[PDB]
């Protein structure tokens, strides 16, 4: 699958730079602007409309919605509106939610991991029944969540950092698990992951050795294979992404806002 690159931007209350930041993302060659779903962050679909008004080619995605925050019928209303009024530029990533304090602040039941995944399941089923036109992404590494992505999603997002970094070998197993559940639909589902850190260096080997301090359970060799880290020159990072597309199927790669400019040269090469 051809590469698509995203940057996860945080639209921040009290800061006046949103439209400028979105323009910088598009001008730097990103294909997707991704926004999160948190209390204390701007509301995601409203922020995405503001981004759409100042950009022309990028897709806009949630990354990912906290399913506890959304009534499925009203979310379907939001998605149809975002789709029609942007001319088809909106995608919806969904997940279970994970910050308990936000559940408590909003007056919502934290429940159990099982009830939070069931809410995601119920919402995905309802959105598909309502035939929402926005492509749907499902994120998260749990068995049930990957099973729901296999059933319902256009894009599956694998998490590489739980932060505890997951090894390439554990990611091999998660991708294979997803593929087995997807069965005949596997070829129809785009695979995404978020790179947490983009570390520009002329000595990737010395860099990985120093990073063992923050990841003691890993060898330097494992660190250089972590899907959530990109280390080296732009050319080395492009080669790494080519290898990881072959290994994991990852063609939709997102980075964090702080690394927007660091990663842009890799887009130039790929």
Residue numbers in the entry: 25 to 186, 196 to 303
Paper's wording?
Central to this pathway is PepI, an F420H2-dependent oxidoreductase. PepI first catalyzes the formation of the central statine, then produces the C-terminal statine moiety. Among these, the homolog kvPepI from Kitasatospora viridis DSM44826, with 53.3% sequence identity to PepI, was more amenable to study.
Upon F420 binding, the kvPepI structure remains virtually unchanged, except for the stabilization of the residues 187–190 that are part of a larger flexible loop (residues 181–201).
